[PDB]
Amino acid sequence: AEAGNDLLSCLTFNGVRNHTVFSADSDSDFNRFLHLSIQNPLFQNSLISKPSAIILPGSKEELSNTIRCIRKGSWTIRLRSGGHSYEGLSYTSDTPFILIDLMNLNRVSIDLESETAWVESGSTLGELYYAITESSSKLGFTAGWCPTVGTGGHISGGGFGMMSRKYGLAADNVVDAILIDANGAILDRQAMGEDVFWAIRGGGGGVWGAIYAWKIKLLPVPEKVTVFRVTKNVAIDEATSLLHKWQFVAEELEEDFTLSVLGGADEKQVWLTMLGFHFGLKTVAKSTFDLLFPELGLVEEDYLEMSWGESFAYLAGLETVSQLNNRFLKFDERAFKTKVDLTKEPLPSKAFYGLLERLSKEPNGFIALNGFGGQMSKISSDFTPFPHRSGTRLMVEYIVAWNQSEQKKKTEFLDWLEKVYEFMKPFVSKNPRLGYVNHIDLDLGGIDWGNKTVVNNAIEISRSWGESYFLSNYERLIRAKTLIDPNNVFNHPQSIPPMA
Ligand SMILES: *[C@@H]1O[C@H](CO)[C@@H](O[C@@H]2O[C@H](CO)[C@@H](O[C@@H]3O[C@H](CO)[C@@H](O)[C@H](O[C@H]4O[C@H](CO)[C@@H](O)[C@H](O)[C@@H]4O[C@H]4O[C@H](CO)[C@@H](O)[C@H](O)[C@@H]4O[C@H]4O[C@H](CO)[C@@H](O)[C@H](O)[C@@H]4O)[C@@H]3O)[C@H](O)[C@H]2NC(C)=O)[C@H](O)[C@H]1NC(C)=O
Ligand SMILES: *Cc1cc2c(nc3c(=O)[nH]c(=O)nc-3n2C[C@H](O)[C@H](O)[C@H](O)COP(=O)(O)OP(=O)(O)OC[C@H]2O[C@@H](n3cnc4c(N)ncnc43)[C@H](O)[C@@H]2O)c(*)c1C
Ligand SMILES: COc1ccc(C[C@H]2c3cc(O)c(OC)cc3CCN2C)cc1O
Ligand SMILES: *[C@@H]1O[C@H](CO)[C@@H](O)[C@H](O)[C@H]1NC(C)=O
């Protein structure tokens, strides 16, 4: 379905002047803006789905009207903030679709009196973090480490980061927000009601409508926090020992502490990158690990004291705090597919050993280990759609990324990742095998919203990944879905089905 004169005239009429139409060209602005926020080259392929038009609204009413104009046609709506969807569900779709890029909605309004902020859904974590440190040295916010990840889909799915052990997810700290429904109705928390305002805070993106802006509570942070990023080159024996003890240390640390691990291997050596964050000074930080985790062999020089801003930039591997404010800094430029696990029981050494052995078989693979507990276990499972709280111990994350040179090995890389996930099945959560909506996994299945045979059973088919992402909260998400989008205008392969 083309993007005809009706759609365009509708946009022109409504003052939404920033938009381009599909172009087979490569030198075109369309293709440029399209590939501008494709954060997973896995989907840069010339055979993937491409929008009939890309619209870049610059205000909440332009956003409202954009949705209104698209509703006059049959197009599927696709919202994009940072475009970091692991499945590229913000710039792809089986059916002809319109791409609503929210990058022009990147304003952060910080209020130092209430210590809250109105973050436009276009604003990325980085641009947000920058705004906060630009305004205060005693304020921060909890969310992912990826500075290019947009708050649009990030906070919509939850938002887990290095401070979540201290403050919970991003969505755990949303006090208000502006959602724009299928009719372009501009709704605040009071207008949308509690069932929906609850849903949008971890229920997923591209499901409830277009978040125009988030109102977050800004969080206290000492003017000096401590972090370390130390890569240990060890053998598999030591690596297992370190990982096996890590899970306990990491999960049982005080909320003022976060210890995350990035593991990979290559035949000979196993490399474990230790990412440390302390909600306080260096001496206390080092004292703690010197006691709890002396095996890391971390030294004084390893611990860096810096502002909270400097720390989230440092942790993200950025050169400077200014780079937090750069939304177009690709952090790898490599295609990838990532599966995640959540643990209820501790993991046997054999699990880390197996993981490390499997890793040593494929250098392009690597695991990310995150501890829960602390503040994550104090927030109710039903406080927000994100269920995994008290009881959840670790977030294990299996990634595999490659170069354009290695595009041929594609299927092989995915094969490895499939083998690793299968290998971990006994050691992780079961019935259901839990997942995280911001780590959306189309392998868990999907829904063909064009197939009425399936659409009639959308809720049960969706159960597979639904209870996996949201567990018991899945029920309330369906009531909330029916209230704000019964027509299922906002959908994607793993969107919450409305009651029909
Ligand atoms: C649809 O949405 C898309 C996405 O948002 C829009 O595309 C964006 O369009 C932006 C402009 O509208 C564009 O910003 C540009 O970014 C470049 C860097 O790539 C930047 O250099 C440009 O900024 C200059 O120009 C603007 C005005 O055009 C000035 O306000 C600004 O101060 C900059 O001018 C200064 O630097 C220039 C060289 O960098 C000098 O030539 C100029 O003289 C001036 O220098 C003075 O100021 C300096 C610093 O203050 C000082 O050192 C010096 O001595 C002088 O005093 C430009 O803004 C984005 O690149 C683009 N974004 C993307 C992702 O493509 C698009 O516009 C929308 N479409 C529609 C229809 O609206
Ligand atoms: C690329 C990348 C992803 C990361 C990174 N680090 C993460 C981390 O530290 N913790 C995590 O929890 N997740 C991490 N991820 C994955 C991201 O969390 C997810 O990819 C988030 O969805 C990020 O959102 P965004 O960058 O905006 O991706 P989009 O593709 O634009 O959107 C995702 C999803 O949400 C819908 N959507 C977008 N915008 C809106 C608005 N404003 N309103 C409602 N819904 C919206 C889209 O349709 C899409 O379906 C580290 C890196 C490098
Ligand atoms: C501190 O905790 C973590 C640290 C790093 C990661 C991996 C990171 C990533 C880093 C890459 O370089 C990359 O290459 C394509 C892909 C990805 C996919 C997931 N993304 C989030 C996950 C974590 O949970
Ligand atoms: C509709 O869904 C069912 C179940 O997946 C499938 O068997 C059938 O082929 C689908 N029909 C269409 C329209 O493709």
UniProtKB/Swiss-Prot annotation:
Q: How is it modified after translation?
A: The FAD cofactor is bound via a bicovalent 6-S-cysteinyl, 8alpha-N1-histidyl FAD linkage.
Q: Does the keyword Disulfide bond apply?
A: yes
This entry's Enzyme Commission designation comes to: 1.21.3.3
Note the position of the cross-link 6-(S-cysteinyl)-8alpha-(pros-histidyl)-FAD (His-Cys): H84-C146
Biological process (GO) annotations held by this record are: alkaloid metabolic process
**Residues with glycosylation annotation:** N18, N403, N451
List required co-factors. Answer: FAD; a metal cation
GO terms for MF: FAD binding; reticuline oxidase activity
Catalysed reactions, semicolon-separated: (S)-reticuline + O2 = (S)-scoulerine + H2O2 + H(+)
Which compartments does it reside in?
Cytoplasmic vesicle
Q: Where is the FAD-binding PCMH-type domain?
A: 47-221
Family named by the database record: Belongs to the oxygen-dependent FAD-linked oxidoreductase family.
Function, as annotated:
Essential to the formation of benzophenanthridine alkaloids in the response of plants to pathogenic attack. Catalyzes the stereospecific conversion of the N-methyl moiety of (S)-reticuline into the berberine bridge carbon of (S)-scoulerine.
Protein name per UniProt: Reticuline oxidase
